[PDB]
Amino acid sequence: FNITETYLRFLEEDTEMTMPIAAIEALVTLLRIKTPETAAEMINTIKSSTEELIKSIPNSVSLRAGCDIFMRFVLRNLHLYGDWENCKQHLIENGQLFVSRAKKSRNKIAEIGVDFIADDDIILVHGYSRAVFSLLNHAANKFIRFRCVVTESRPSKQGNQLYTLLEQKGIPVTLIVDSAVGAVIDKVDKVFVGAEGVAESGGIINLVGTYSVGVLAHNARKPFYVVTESHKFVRMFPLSSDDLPMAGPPLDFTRRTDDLEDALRGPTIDYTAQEYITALITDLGVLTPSAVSEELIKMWYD
């Protein structure tokens, strides 16, 4: 029936259906066909489909995290030894209810996380997450004064994409390069970030230059922010500064070339430690330091 193909169908869609929430909705559809009455036939085939999904993954982390929460909810269903049928109907229904919860959470955060941006504050924003930009838009809806500084992130050129999406709103902007990002931290009140994942330790899984931002801000004593939707938690503990799950290059040094083809190769995803984050924002209240681990301990019961 396929799950990778269902995820590939979301091309011109996105924005509303968040990348993990669309993968979770795809997991529920695959579950509801071949009877969730059996726990040997279904769960094993769900595990095989997640393994097939991980094997097809090039540079995504959040899809593995979202699977875990689904699994957890499924197991928790019939924890009351309830009827093998009303528990099943509640499990199938919690697929569309899971996607509907992404809207309700965004409604919560955009009213909570506008408080952090005070009267007339210049912001240097890095990365693009649907939660951080929704704060930025619904603060403009709240009629609050804020300036914006764009970071030239280099994955699939994200800075230019961010700049254009800020133009459509009506907020004054200018391009700042990630090389010169050190020379900006004096005319900037606060530094904001959108994460691809949040660590078990309390650190962050992010883009092509975020640790560098974290350290410079720690030097300048200027605050460093992480805002996300509460589903990007993996049981992952990157022990060192340069160790992450990869399908491509972990720093490759190429031979002598004349035509100039083999060059680009650098760490596209980088980790930053727990100390560098001043504040973290999700729908699960306002919490930062040891909070992430407590969430993971509560979920995994281990």
């Binding site: 078990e200 330790s201 309390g202 049981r235 503990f237 022990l239 060192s240 500064s241 160790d243 430690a273 727990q274 100390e275 330091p289 040891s290 681990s293 407590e294 301990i297 281990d302």
Partner: protein, 355 residues
């Protein structure tokens, strides 16, 4: 009853927080104490191998022997003079060597088990099930938990890697043995050691017996060995509710250098190792030992020289003091491996409330 007061060397102007004294050679004692306790106290007084983890395992086994030797009196019941006898054991242990945290959690478990079983059941039926439960407790909380640390570390360490270690922790020895033999990697293991005892030497010796590429080093020679290293493993003793690492001697020095020289620090721990007591510096509560171990020009351990040093009492202020159990700063270590898999050091008391 025992020997108390009258201590070797000066009282000292700086650092006088803990007892510096005790019985090494047996003179004047009570004739009721079980000899396995008397053996362990004579062991721990001049011990070279043990460091936190094995001390409790030995303490459990000695207790298992006592219960196996225990026959309930006809007049006095089981919970009558047992707890007094155990209090005599601990007091004799305290005189020999200050207890570990894991030892305290064991005693607390045993005292809970005394209260759980009421004096009504037959005596031979009672102790038979008791030792079975202790064995299962030692299986779960040590052996099986240790194996869980092993596999957690296995995923964490990269292929073909250099590791610098310290101490004589049971968990780390078995860790490295698992790396060399069962997994078969290119592991360069460098071991460091201090002066009071040759813990690292013994670990390196055992690693040599396995056939590992081992460099052996000292604290003085650190700023040369680093300039190579990828991971640093520390032998845990106790992590407090703060998140501070209360461990052996040359630990924090290594931890500091590592943090400054980019490469992280890793600490393997047990769910029995955590405590609810709190401190922030090395001065707070220290495991002090007699300068007698630091008199000789080291090389091995017994050499007996007519050297430069000799007098401590008669000399006008010459405090040759050393510590054993020190503190590492909180932010510096990054990983902790336990019964509940993983968790950073800033999340210390997620085990104490989970129980």
């Amino acid at each position: 009853p025992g020997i108390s007061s009258v201590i070797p060397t000066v009282l000292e102007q700086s650092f006088d927080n803990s007892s510096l004294i005790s019985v090494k050679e047996l003179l004047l004692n009570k004739d009721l104490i079980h000899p396995s306790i008397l053996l362990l106290t004579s062991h721990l007084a001049h011990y070279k191998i043990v460091g936190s983890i094995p001390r409790c395992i030995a303490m459990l086994e000695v207790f298992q022997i006592v219960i196996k030797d225990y026959q309930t009196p006809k007049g006095t019941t089981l919970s009558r003079n047992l707890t007094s006898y155990l209090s005599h054991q601990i007091d004799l242990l305290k005189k020999a060597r200050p207890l570990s945290v894991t030892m305290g959690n064991a005693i607390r478990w045993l005292k809970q088990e005394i209260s759980l079983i009421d004096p009504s059941t037959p005596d031979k039926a009672a102790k038979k099930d008791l030792c079975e439960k202790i064995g299962q407790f030692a299986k779960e909380k040590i052996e099986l938990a240790d194996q869980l640390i092993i596999d957690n570390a296995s995923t964490q360490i990269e292929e073909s890697t250099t590791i610098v270690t310290y101490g004589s922790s049971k968990v780390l020895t078995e860790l490295l043995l698992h790396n060399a033999i069962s997994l078969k990697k290119n592991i360069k293991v460098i071991v460091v050691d201090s002066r009071p005892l040759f813990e690292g030497r013994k670990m390196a010796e055992t690693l040599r017996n396995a056939g590992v590429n081992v460099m052996y080093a000292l604290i003085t020679s650190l700023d040369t060995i680093f300039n190579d290293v990828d991971y640093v493993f520390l032998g845990a003793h106790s992590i407090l509710s703060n998140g501070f690492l209360y461990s052996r001697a040359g630990t924090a020095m290594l931890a500091m250098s590592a943090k400054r020289r980019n490469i992280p620090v890793l600490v393997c721990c047990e769910s029995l190792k955590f405590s609810q007591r709190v401190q922030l510096d090395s001065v707070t509560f220290n495991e002090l030992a007699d300068p007698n171990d630091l008199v000789n020009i080291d090389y091995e351990n017994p050499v007996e020289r007519r050297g430069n040093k000799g007098a401590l009492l008669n000399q006008f202020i010459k405090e040759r003091k050393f510590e054993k159990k020190k503190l590492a700063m909180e932010n510096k270590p990054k990983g902790n491996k336990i019964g509940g898999k993983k968790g950073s050091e800033g999340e210390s008391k997620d085990a104490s409330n989970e129980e």
